[PDB]
Ligand binder design. Sequence first.
Ligand SMILES: O=c1ccn([C@@H]2O[C@H](COP(=O)(O)O)[C@@H](O)[C@H]2O)c(=O)[nH]1
Length: 193
Amino acid sequence: YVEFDSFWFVQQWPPAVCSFQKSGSCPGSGLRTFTIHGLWPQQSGTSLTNCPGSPFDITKISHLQSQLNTLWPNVLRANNQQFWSHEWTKHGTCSESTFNQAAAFKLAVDMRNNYDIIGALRPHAAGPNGRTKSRQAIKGFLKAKFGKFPGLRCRTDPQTKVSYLVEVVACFAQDGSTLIDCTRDTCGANFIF
Ligand SMILES: O=c1ccn([C@@H]2O[C@H](COP(=O)(O)O)[C@@H](O)[C@H]2O)c(=O)[nH]1
């Protein structure tokens, strides 16, 4: 069996994520704050997925639904539970040996409350404005605020080839509490944000 050695706390930028879904409606299109995508256990540089764990049980986190509906909405479809269930089954099960479902979602909520990206960039006016930003600059501002380098993830429009920031990753040690440096970015030196 495999033992995760770290976590990737992944937050997503709703507007960008929605823009890549040019086919249909997008519930979170109007959100202007980073929301939780998921907490992904890592192993030797790779995300551990689909581990032999417990079925998702909404009643196990019923007490967090309040916070989850605000910080962890399904931005693509109007079904938050489906999104939480998927993230648990695909990612959460892989760290269940230490964190049961209730503990994992609570961990994600706490991490989100301790990692306000927009708030951290505002003092530098480095927030979203649909213009080009520097990977180095953004990583620098976040490290100065939180203490460690985040991971920046981008997606490229197939038509225009323009790169857009879509997710920001905060890396944690196996304890799920000690912030550590992220080392992998999918974003190039510059991107739209
Ligand atoms: O707000 C969101 C963001 C992503 N996804 C979905 O989750 C998957 C991406 O997450 P992952 O499987 O890599 O954890 C995709 O199928 C995507 O449609 C949602 O349902 N809602």
